Design a protein around this ligand. Structure first.
Ligand SMILES: CC1(C)CC(N)CC(C)(C)N1[O-]
Ligand SMILES: CC1(C)CC(N)CC(C)(C)N1[O-]
Length: 164
């Protein structure tokens, strides 16, 4: 297991523009295109992201290229953020993947808003952190994914992904 595998499971793979769990146009492995309700705007974002005029459909290789860029962008967002970087630095590699997963789903600003959870993670109070992370819109809106990510923080293992 690694972060690419983890997010590939959590996000799936779709080669045509679709709507994500919040209703936003997305493609590939969870690549958010826009929050605009305009499909034309989303298609323009896709063309710009891929570098060619698309019909709203990309190849698997193109989806994986965007995905690697997006994982990198999630790590960059963590490392440039004064609240996320010290937490990330304090974590083992499995729990680092859990934090990257959250930032991939919600963005740097959103995850940096988990102030009290971040402090508990840095303190390595894993069960207390797990409870606090569940008191969130995130957990209520995507509970199965949040449970997998929280189990990863709680245990430092890939147990929540093993049978998947
Ligand atoms: C690519 C795929 C099918 C995604 C799953 N979410 C996890 C792993 C184990 C990596 N595999 O193989
Ligand atoms: C303190 C701790 C370990 C955190 C859990 N998330 C919830 C309760 C049941 C309150 N427990 O046991």
């Amino acid at each position: 297991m690694n972060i690419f595998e983890m997010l590939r499971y959590d996000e799936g793979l779709r080669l045509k523009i679709y709507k994500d769990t919040e209703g936003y146009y997305t493609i590939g492995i969870g690549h958010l295109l826009t929050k605009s309700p305009s499909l034309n705007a989303a298609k323009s974002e896709l063309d710009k992201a891929i570098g060619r005029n698309t019909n709203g459909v990309i190849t698997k290789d193109e989806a994986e290229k965007l995905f690697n860029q997006d994982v990198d962008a999630a790590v960059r967002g963590i490392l440039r953020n004064a609240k996320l970087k010290p937490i990330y630095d304090s974590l083992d590699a499995v729990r680092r993947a859990a934090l990257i997963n959250m930032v991939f789903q919600m963005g740097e600003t959103g995850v940096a808003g988990f102030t009290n959870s971040l402090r508990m993670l840095q303190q390595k109070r894993w069960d207390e952190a797990a409870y606090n992370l569940a008191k969130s819109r995130w957990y209520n809106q995507t509970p199965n994914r949040a449970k997998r990510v929280i189990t990863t923080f709680r245990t430092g293992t890939w147990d929540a992904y093993k049978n998947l």
